[PDB]
């Protein structure tokens, strides 16, 4: 149980680190590629 609790605490710490990293770091495609190919040699 102590090892499982330590693993859960480590998982919570890893999730907190991931959240901190996320904080620190922070149909139209086809038709517009078609008009891109049209206007490339228009």
């Amino acid at each position: 149980p102590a090892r499982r609790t330590l693993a859960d605490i480590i998982m919570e710490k890893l999730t907190e680190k991931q959240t901190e990293v996320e904080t620190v770091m922070s149909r139209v495609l086809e038709v517009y590629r078609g008009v891109r190919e049209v206007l490339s040699k228009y």
Binding site: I10, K17, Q18, V21
Partner: peptide, 13 residues
């Protein structure tokens, strides 16, 4: 000691 998984998580040169 943590935050290395997030360091390798970001893949930018």
């Amino acid at each position: 000691t943590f935050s290395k998984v997030q360091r390798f998580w970001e893949s930018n040169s």
